[PDB]
Design a protein around this nucleic acid. Structure first.
Lengths: 63, 209, 145, 124
RNA sequence: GGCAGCCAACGUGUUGGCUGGGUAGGGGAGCGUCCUGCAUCCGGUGAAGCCGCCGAGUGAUCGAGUGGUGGAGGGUGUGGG
RNA sequence: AAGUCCAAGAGUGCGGCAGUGAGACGGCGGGGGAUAAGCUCCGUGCGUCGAGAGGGAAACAGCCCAGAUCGCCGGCUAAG
RNA sequence: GCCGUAGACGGUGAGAGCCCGGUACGUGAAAACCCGACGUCUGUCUUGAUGGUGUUCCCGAGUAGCAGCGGGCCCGUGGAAUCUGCUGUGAAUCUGCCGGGACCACCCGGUAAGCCUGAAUACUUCCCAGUGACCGAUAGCGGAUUAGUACCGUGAGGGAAUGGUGAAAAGUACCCCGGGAGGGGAGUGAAAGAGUACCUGAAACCGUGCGCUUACAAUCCGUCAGAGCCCUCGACGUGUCGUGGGGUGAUGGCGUGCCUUUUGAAGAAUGAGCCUGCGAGUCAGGGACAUGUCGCGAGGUUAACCCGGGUGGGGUAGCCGCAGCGAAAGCGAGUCUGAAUAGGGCGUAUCCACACAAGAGUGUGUGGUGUAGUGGUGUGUUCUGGACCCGAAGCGGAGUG
């Protein structure tokens, strides 16, 4: 039997050209009125998955 | 390019064959040859061994007695592994042992084996094993005795030559094979590799074309 | 002469299997599991973090869609063409796959990375601006399929 | 390949049971009880190999003190005097002299007494 | 006085300096059992097994050292499971 | 700025494999309690037991001395 | 010495090509059946084909389509296409109708509501011939022995244990003790330390004989010192020492079982009467990650399948590597955001030298050196599977009372 990739992990995480695993930041979907624009601007884009989650994220992505 | 002289059953020398360097002068590779021969034996082995686990042992579908009160150990089936007559926990099951070694590895191992044979001067070319149309183990034995005095000899004979196959078939240490089916295990098993001339040219043409 | 009993594995090839739970000398009575618990008996799923919202559920899904009508190209740079064709000449997809530069039956786009110093007649599905200029400057034609 | 454990098992069983000969009761007949007693016996042997040196030294000191007091000197003063006179004889051979050569022991007592200070309680 | 681990020095393996309690656990190297490819040796002038003696190794253990009993198969080296 | 430096077998980064996530008592600083508990909750480049044998405390995990590679029918000491 | 197209495998008084059944290789069918071939026989075409020109009729009906409620599709009702069940409603015959993931237009494909069809594929109750880095009597089928038997249950149903004398019975004539059983002589046999209680014959357990020790003594049953007695190996005299070895041990010091599980157990916590057998990290997959080792190497490699009495030879379809950035269109050693040559994110393997700038941490440019993956296989983890082994109360389906 082949190994199945985790669907949520696949939809949440991507990889870069060298192998960095990349995620998105939270607290941005709604309730945006009282959030200042400075805090809103640090919450978008992508960030590298922290070294603690690297192993589990790789496991979920590969199999 | 080492030479090999052709002999005849009559005892005379017919001609010479030129063994290509790319086939008979490669450097032996012990680890590669060991891997290939081990893979060959693994493919040879048949794994028709089996045991019945706790599931396929007959009976034993009922709890033998109550969980509590009897003063004995808890048992859930009379066929549990710890029972006499119970199933086997991690026992043999039929399995396929053959592995997928690359063709380049296989061919290089065969080249190394035949190259070692050539280097130690153990390759013989023969126009024909016995005089045609009737098998004769006596004639074949005499000719092979004049050829090599070693115990185990491989004979590489074409598919259509029945007289030589039937003639050397019964000799104890002799193994008869086709030029198409040359393999590292057989080559290393033999002390001497006795080629028929047509088998030699067929092998050389097939591998160099 | 090499016989069948002279065949040995390469040094460091084979490593002795770890047989576990075979006495207190090596790995006894627990087999490297420690005392009781969950891991003492079965396993723990990877996507499980003890009860709190797992890492794959508390982050937003990556934005966007996939666009299954995407036209994907296999790319080759002018530097590789320069290295592989010292004598110049016509360069099409057939010889680009012959010299092992792109896949066999794909779409080829040519990119201008290296330096081109030979006369070459390139034919491809698509060309980049830099690649086309670099090919033209060396007196070659960038014929587009 | 089904393997029978008989040969491998009886090897160690015979070894332990032979090593446990002369024990009393179940400890010389039964493999498990013999194994337990073997654990204890080897622990005791290892401990007493260390403690035997001290026990023999205690015996030697007792004999040396007995003979020294027969020569009208105490053990501590005799040892201090022998240390001062530079005599390097150890307690085993001192006890051997005491039991076997009383005259030689008396000579050593006299040497120690001569090398002792005039007043042993003086602050120097 | 004997052994082992790490490191250094000099050389085609010796010397020296430090170090060597240990549960969960990690790492390295090994003994014994069976079945096998290949090569060798022993065996009704007595194999295996079992019971002893006399010994041996740092350990699991060993005795191509020897007696008794027994009556037909084993040992060794190097690989495979 | 030095020291240790044929070692602490030290720090830091990444990776393979873990176990642990019930602690105890003793010394100092505290809370709760009656400034009781062999009580309970914290702090401590504090210690020991846990996972630590040997000597002393009569016996006596946690106190004092001291960290067991092996042998010796050698010597000097620690607490006592 | 001989045979060998025969040196496969078994038996025969111990390892047999030449003693036997056989083996290689050839021969054999009255009858029955199964295959083919040629015929009688049957059918069909021959009152028959062709290439052309312009109009009406026909081309599968309670069907398609639509609606309601469902099923199944990667698709869990979602914008829900295609297929399909029940209930209603219900069309046209070719400028017709159905499909191209709601729908509409255009182009494309096809011609539903009639029916038959081999091969490639799946399985073995049964029959024949073989094979095993499968088991060898607590194993292997439950069943090598009376086996679905004995026994248990009202019933459905559950369900065992029990192999080996010897080469040949040559299975102990006869005598003695004994009511017999059993034995002692005598015989058979190479062996009766093979006597139908029978190959070998271990441990627990139970005796008999001999040596030392033990009835003033508080013993986790040992250990370290150790008198005495006894037995051996040597040298020497009449019994006395040694580089000795063994067996017992009067007496002295020291000394709180094993395992689990615990802060902590000799614990008055748990488990174990004893011995002998058996009883727990295994296997599958081009699976995932890491690390050895081997082949090739900017390439590596085949899957199904085809041909070989084999482990060998072919097979380029695919997969991985070779360019990245972006939600995407797209652009590309750059790219995205952005009005920005204005900063930032990601990327251009990595190093060295040289210039230009800056000391807001260094950046930007020119040169070189140049980039390492992939396929087998060992090991450690991991995924899906009963997944290291044992253990509930209970839950479903079908039956028996």
């Amino acid at each position: 039997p082949k190994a199945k990739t985790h669907s949520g992990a696949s939809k949440r995480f991507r990889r870069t050209g060298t192998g960095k695993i990349v995620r998105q930041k939270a607290n941005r979907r709604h309730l945006l009125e009282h959030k200042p624009t400075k805090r809103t601007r640090r919450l978008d884009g992508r960030t590298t998955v922290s070294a603690a989650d690297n192993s589990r994220i790789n496991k979920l992505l590969n199999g | 390019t080492l030479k090999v002289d052709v002999k005849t059953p009559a005892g005379k020398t017919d001609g010479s064959v030129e063994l290509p360097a790319e086939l008979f002068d490669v450097e032996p590779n012990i680890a590669l040859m060991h891997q290939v021969v081990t893979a060959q034996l693994a493919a040879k082995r048949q794994g028709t061994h089996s045991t019945k686990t706790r599931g396929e042992v007959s009976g034993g579908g009922k709890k033998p007695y109550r969980q509590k009160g009897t003063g004995r150990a808890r048992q859930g089936s009379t066929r549990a592994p710890q029972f006499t007559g119970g199933g086997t926990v991690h026992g043999p099951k039929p399995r396929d042992y053959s592995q997928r070694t690359p063709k380049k590895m296989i061919a290089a191992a065969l080249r190394g084996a035949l190259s070692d044979r050539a280097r130690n001067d153990r390759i013989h070319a023969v126009t024909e094993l016995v005089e045609g149309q009737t098998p004769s183990t006596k004639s074949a034995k005499t000719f092979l005795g004049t050829l090599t005095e070693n115990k185990k000899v491989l004979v590489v004979i074409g598919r259509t030559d029945e007289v030589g196959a039937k003639s050397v078939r019964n000799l104890p240490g002799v193994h008869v094979i086709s030029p198409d089916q040359l393999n590292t295990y057989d080559v290393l098993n033999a002390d001497d590799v006795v080629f028929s001339v047509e088998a030699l040219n067929a092998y050389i043409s097939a591998n160099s074309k | 002469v090499i016989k069948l009993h002279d065949l040995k594995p390469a040094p460091g090839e084979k490593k002795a299997k770890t047989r576990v739970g075979r006495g207190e000398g090596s790995k006894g009575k627990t087999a490297g599991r420690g005392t009781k618990g969950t891991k003492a008996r079965k396993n723990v799923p990877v996507m499980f973090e003890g009860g709190q919202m797992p890492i794959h559920m508390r982050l937003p899904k990556l934005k966007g869609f996939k666009n299954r009508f995407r036209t994907e190209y296999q790319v080759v740079n002018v530097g590789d063409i320069n290295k592989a064709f010292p004598q110049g000449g016509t360069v099409g997809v057939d010889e680009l796959v012959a010299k092992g530069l792109v896949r066999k039956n794909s779409l080829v786009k040519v990119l201008g990375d290296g330096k081109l110093t030979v006369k070459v007649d390139v034919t491809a599905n698509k060309f980049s601006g830099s690649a086309r200029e670099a090919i033209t400057a060396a007196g070659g034609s960038a014929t587009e399929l | 390949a089904r393997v029978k454990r008989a040969l491998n098992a009886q090897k160690k069983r015979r070894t332990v049971l032979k090593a446990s000969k002369g024990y009393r009761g179940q400890r010389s007949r039964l493999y498990r009880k013999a194994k337990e007693q073997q654990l204890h016996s080897l622990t005791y042997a290892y401990r007493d190999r260390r403690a035997r040196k001290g026990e023999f030294r205690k015996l030697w000191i007792s004999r040396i003190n007995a003979a020294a007091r027969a020569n009208d000197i105490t053990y501590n003063r005799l040892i201090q005097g022998l240390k001062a006179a530079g005599v390097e004889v150890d307690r085993k051979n001192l006890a051997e002299l005491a039991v076997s050569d009383p005259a030689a022991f008396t000579a050593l007592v006299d040497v120690a007494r001569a090398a002792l200070p005039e007043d042993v309680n003086a602050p120097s």
